[PDB]
Design a protein around this ligand. Structure first.
Ligand SMILES: [Zn+2]
Ligand SMILES: [Zn+2]
Lengths: 302, 302
């Protein structure tokens, strides 16, 4: 299998402007994202949310590419993002069809101090592991992590799950509604390597069995809450900005205004991720706990 | 025993969480902001914007405290904030009247790397120049910076301007809708010193003359724009995060996606502030130019 149809999504969330800015540039002069023998389409997924420069209009677009939403009768009555979701599935899918696109990169941003991050939706997918191994290794010494999202009741119905091979791209720290240049540079480098991988894959290159480190999600921790549901403590200074780095039972986790430290607890070291994400205030979450495990890929061919 | 009425406003902008959080705490336990012989009211100015974690509902509350809005007949058609401003004005004013609050602190956050910032509205105000000198001195060796908004033109109209002695407290960088512990420690300390000053002054402690460096707004700078009026370049990596530091005629300012470097130009040195402030994308602006000038205060007693 050669890859034929590659797309780059920007503006899934309208106030994550790195994607929006790159995608809008690339819809004018696309040279950067083409490769000899490869044809890739840039696309703004949520134009309404990008105009208002807001996360979403009626509901989060990045949580609805599932059966419950993609298979309901089209009606101007529907929440905007649902109408949009079908519009996108019909363009780049349909999801779970042989006709759907081969790879979609879906570009995101985070207020968390994560750096260049790749999101894996299938720990068994050998083509994705090889891609991600390629992107990590290439980027060095620029740090780059892989966030693993299966399992088994907690998976999201994402925009890029339309593809046979879904690829999430997150780069942080960045405030929402801010275009930073370091971040934009890092994101354009990640894509550069991703698109060069696909190009090498097509040209017939073999990749030897490889091994990458991933961080598998396990549990989302919410903030200590009040007898109302108001946040009662904040992310401890010592945990702030320490995404990916080991957090041990003893370690400070939250801090109250009165000054008291609330520690981790539990049996083992976890690796905090999305520490203090703007978007997860609403959704009740301070960060996600992840375990550090190794994924091995078998060799791959043209 | 002169200064009697003091208010600490929080959540003028709903998505700036630090003020929102401190005021909310202090409503339950005000001990931190009490000073013997001194009564201090904390207050959420924009509850509706807070609830939605949004900057404003209909218009920006921090720019409508003028004759035009404050003096129009109360109605339901009027924007949410207009109607709120008249309430806050009847509660803590009326503005320009003897029986308005003496001092108001209005707590803000910026996405710019600015550190502790005090906002001075009146360069001839001996009282405020002393308060600012006191806070500066008390905070040392932690930097504290004074921003002076006097023109003619470029002036609001602010929520605090209700008071005889308005004071604006701005702490950054923090992403909108996020609540960093470090940022909350700095605003706290700032407020601690401000209330101490007022307490020292009321107890007839004399202050000798002093001098502070302030930074005068001279011009807002917009991003280079498109054919259709889009941002065509971004804040240069060199200029990113360098608020308050000097910028020079030949110095890099904006970077294009190419990336071409757009230099400063002009023939004098300037001091950027609000560099890459999220709230100013909408308002068509990239940073403010300021000039660094020294201000004097005569001595003050009572
Ligand atoms: Zn996103
Ligand atoms: Zn503000």
């Amino acid at each position: 299998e050669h890859i034929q149809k590659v797309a780059i999504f920007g503006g899934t969330h309208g106030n994550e402007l790195t994607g929006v800015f790159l995608v809008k540039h690339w819809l004018e002069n696309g040279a950067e994202i083409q490769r000899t023998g490869l044809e890739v389409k840039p696309f703004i997924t949520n134009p309404r949310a990008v105009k208002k420069c807001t996360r979403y209009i009626d509901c989060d677009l990045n949580r609805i590419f599932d059966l419950e939403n993609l298979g309901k009768k089209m009606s101007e009555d529907l929440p905007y993002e649902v109408r949009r979701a079908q519009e996108i599935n019909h363009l780049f899918g349909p999801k779970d069809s042989e006709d759907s696109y081969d790879i979609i990169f879906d570009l995101h941003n985070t207020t968390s101090n994560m750096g260049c991050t790749l999101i894996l939706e299938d720990s068994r997918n050998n083509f994705l592991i090889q891609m991600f191994h390629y992107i990590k290794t290439s980027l060095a010494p620029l740090p780059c992590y892989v966030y693993l999202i299966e399992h088994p009741s907690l998976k999201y119905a994402t925009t890029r799950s339309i593809a046979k091979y879904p690829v999430g791209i997150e780069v942080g720290p960045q405030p929402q509604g801010v275009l930073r240049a370091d971040i934009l540079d890092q994101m354009r480098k990640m894509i550069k390597h991703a698109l060069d991988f696909i190009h090498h894959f097509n040209e017939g290159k073999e990749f030897p069995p490889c091994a990458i480190e991933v961080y598998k999600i396990i549990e989302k921790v919410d903030y200590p809450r009040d007898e109302n549901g108001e946040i009662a403590a904040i992310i401890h200074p010592n945990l702030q900005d320490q995404d990916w780095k080991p957090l041990h039972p003893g370690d400070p986790m939250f801090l109250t205004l009165d000054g008291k430290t609330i520690p981790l607890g539990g049996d083992c070291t976890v690796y905090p991720v999305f520490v203090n994400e703007a978007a997860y205030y609403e959704k009740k979450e301070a960060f996600a706990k992840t375990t550090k495990l190794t994924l091995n890929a078998k060799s791959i061919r043209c």
